[PDB]
Write a protein that binds this ligand. Structure first.
Ligand SMILES: OC[C@H]1O[C@H](OC[C@H]2O[C@H](O[C@]3(CO)O[C@H](CO)[C@@H](O)[C@@H]3O)[C@H](O)[C@@H](O)[C@@H]2O)[C@H](O)[C@@H](O)[C@H]1O
Length: 385
């Protein structure tokens, strides 16, 4: 009678809201039960489960990932090309992450990356949003001079600075394809310390390495600790994705939250990075395909999607959803969503990303400029060969 399906979740920040939508689905479909699964190291466990052959019915997988690309070709995921609900996805966002000209992922939302800032304290200290690298250098120094902590960096979570270093190369080269040309599709051992592009990368990275730029006990600070630190007003800024604001809002800040994109060398060269945030795939070997499809179809509904957006905040590709204006806290970060200024994660054409997080954070810890170059070459050479 009643059949149970599973939804593998990687959106830890939205657990409470996604479970609320699930119950709303369960109340409308009494013959269907859905288990929302949240596990630590969800990326590794999903790899484990896909190999083991215990693929969850509905899977939150990021559509730019090589995992999605490889598994879709293998036939792990159901083809969703001829589904009616795929027409509810505007901006041709479903077709963007097509594999063999076939859609295997429904990306509901698009995540972005930038800098969160405390509007109140910024006004209090009379500081403006930077528009160049040099202005971003000056802002950090001026916060230090005022006796405040500019950045809250999570030293124990290297992934938090993934978007930062990816935008460091992006603003240095011009975009995503330009960044992958220097790092990924270049010759083996092409990345040199003398390269102006690498000199630019270091310069952008050195902004996090200004004297007194980071909070006390940052080396062993987690993602949760930095959210709390920013919410209390211990730090004025924190670099993170658009996925963080729901957890920041949770902590009840005593200030209005603002965002801005990482600037380029000159004005009007700022970029953002991201892909499908809330992005769902259906297992091809699911025992209950009708029930699983209905669950995905449910999330494509505008009044259901409004429930998610009003909490999350990331731009949605779903039609009929009233999105927040330019007064929104995520505005400065997510303004250029679905434009040329928003480039896909660079690990769309990599084999992994874990080591890129390491070498990014290692530099913030050490400052070894040659060491970072060595790490970059050591990371990208296996992909070229
Ligand atoms: O830049 C980091 C990350 O961005 C994209 O994934 C967005 C995703 O990141 C975070 O999720 C975690 C850490 O909390 O990261 C892994 C996935 O990489 C998950 O196991 C875990 O939940 C945020 O907490 C999420 O809200 C957000 O959805 C991109 O897809 C990744 O490749 C990676 O570059």
């Amino acid at each position: 009678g009643t059949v149970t399906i599973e939804y593998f979740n990687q959106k830890k920040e939205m657990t409470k809201t996604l479970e609320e939508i699930t119950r709303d689905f369960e109340k409308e479909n009494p013959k269907i039960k859905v288990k929302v699964v949240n596990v630590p190291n969800a990326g590794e466990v999903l790899k484990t489960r896909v190999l083991a052959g215990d693929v969850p019915d509905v899977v939150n997988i990021y559509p730019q990932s090589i995992e999605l690309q490889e598994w879709a070709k293998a036939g792990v995921f159901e083809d969703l090309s001829n589904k009616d609900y795929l027409k509810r996805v505007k901006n041709g966002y479903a077709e963007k992450y097509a594999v063999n000209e076939k859609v295997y992922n429904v990306p509901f939302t698009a995540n972005a990356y930038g800098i969160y800032y405390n509007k109140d304290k910024f006004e209090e200290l009379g500081l403006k949003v930077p528009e160049t690298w040099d202005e971003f250098e000056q802002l950090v120094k001026d916060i230090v001079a005022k006796g405040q902590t500019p950045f809250g960096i999570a030293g124990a979570d290297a992934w938090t600075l993934n978007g930062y270093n990816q935008l460091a190369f992006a603003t240095a080269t011009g975009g995503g394809k330009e960044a992958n040309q220097y790092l990924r599709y270049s010759q083996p051992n092409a990345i040199k310390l003398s390269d102006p592009i690498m000199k630019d990368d270091i310069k952008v990275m050195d902004i996090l390495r200004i004297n007194g730029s980071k909070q006390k006990n940052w080396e062993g600070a987690g993602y949760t600790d930095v959210i709390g630190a920013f919410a209390r007003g211990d730090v004025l800024m924190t670099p993170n994705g658009s996925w963080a604001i729901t957890a920041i809002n949770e902590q009840k800040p005593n200030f209005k939250i603002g965002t801005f994109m990482i600037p380029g060398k000159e004005k009007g060269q700022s970029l953002t990075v991201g892909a499908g945030d809330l992005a769902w795939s259906i297992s091809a070997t699911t025992k209950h395909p009708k029930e699983a499809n209905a669950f995905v179809e449910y999330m494509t509904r505008p009044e259901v999607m409004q429930k998610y957006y009003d909490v999350d905040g990331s731009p949605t590709a779903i039609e009929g959803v009233k999105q927040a204006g330019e007064d929104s806290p995520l505005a400065g970060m997510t303004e250029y969503a679905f434009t040329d200024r928003h480039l896909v994660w660079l690990q769309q054409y990599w084999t992994s990303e874990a080591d890129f997080h390491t070498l990014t954070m290692n530099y913030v810890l050490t400052g070894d400029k040659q060491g970072m170059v060595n790490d970059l070459n050591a990371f990208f050479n296996p992909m070229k060969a």
